[model samples]
Target: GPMDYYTLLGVDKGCSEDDLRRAYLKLAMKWHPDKHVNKGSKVEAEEKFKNICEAYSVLSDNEKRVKYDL
Candidate 1:
């Protein structure tokens, strides 16, 4: 039930930009909504994909990252 952005992306607090991007890219491909229809369910993939995007959105922005750490 890890809810933090870093935890969501399987990264550490000190993760570099490249590391973060790599993690996001990998998860994005794996969790893309349309890609999971037969393997599991579109709805589940959509939710997870959304969360991954949200996590990246915040972590990838310095301003948002500042607020998130607080």
Candidate 2:
């Protein structure tokens, strides 16, 4: 009953492509490892960034999204 990908990208299932793109870009930049240098936070940021990148990639592709839904 819990779907993580949509939440990871801060997008709802009904989100438009534009909305998804905007949300992904915003979160991606915010969590990007390059923008962090707090040591601990830098590592955490990299993890979060990679997670969001994966979630975005999966849901942004028509074929992959369909497969994932199944």
Candidate 3:
């Protein structure tokens, strides 16, 4: 799943910053490339983890999150 932003980030249909961050941190720790690997697989984790990071990047920032809603 390429994270629909709202779904992968675990936010409500219209979530707030507090809600977004809470969900982001949870997924971050779980899916973070470093967590499940030793050196980490760049090719595999690159796209997926990048997507994870991308989600976190947008969710962690207020402006981006709002822009998404718009």
Candidate 4:
């Protein structure tokens, strides 16, 4: 399997920055650790949230995103 930045963020590879950010924000809010306790285990939520954050960080940066066509 390959690294799935697009799938992780729920957007297409050609999606615009605005689209990426929108997806990131939506997922971030949904998986926020604070809300996790109510939704599920805090530990699980924290780890999953971290992964989403990492995915966003990489995909959001210009240079990183330029490395895009990977």
User: Which regions of candidate 1 fall more than 4 Å away from where they truly are?
Assistant: 38-40
Please provide the root mean square deviation of candidate 1 (C-alpha atoms, Å): 2.1
Better of 1 and 3 by TM-score: 1
Tens digits of lDDT, candidate 2, 1-70:
3348888887787676677779889999999877897667898898888888888888888787778778
C-alpha RMSD values across all candidates: 2.1, 2.4, 3.2, 2.1
Q: Say what the RMSD of model 3 is.
A: 3.2
Assess every candidate by TM-score: 0.85, 0.83, 0.64, 0.82
TM-score of 4: 0.82
Model 3 lDDT per residue over 1-70, tens place: 3457777666776677677678877877766767657755646655666676788687678787677667
| Clashes per candidate (backbone, < 3 Å) | 0, 0, 0, 0
Q: For model 1, how does the per-residue alpha-carbon lDDT over 1-70 read when each residue is reduced to its tens digit? A: 3388898889998888788899999999989866887775788888889899989988899887888887
Error of 3 at 20 (Å): 0.8
TM-score, ranked from best to worst: 1, 2, 4, 3
Global local distance difference test of model 3: 0.70
The numbered model that scores best in TM-score is 1
Off by over 4 Å in 4: 1-3, 38-40
Winner by lDDT between candidate 3 and candidate 1? 1
Off by over 4 Å in 2: 1-3
Candidate scoring better on lDDT of 1 and 2? 1
**Colliding residue pairs in candidate 4:** none
lDDT, candidates in the order shown: 0.86, 0.81, 0.70, 0.83
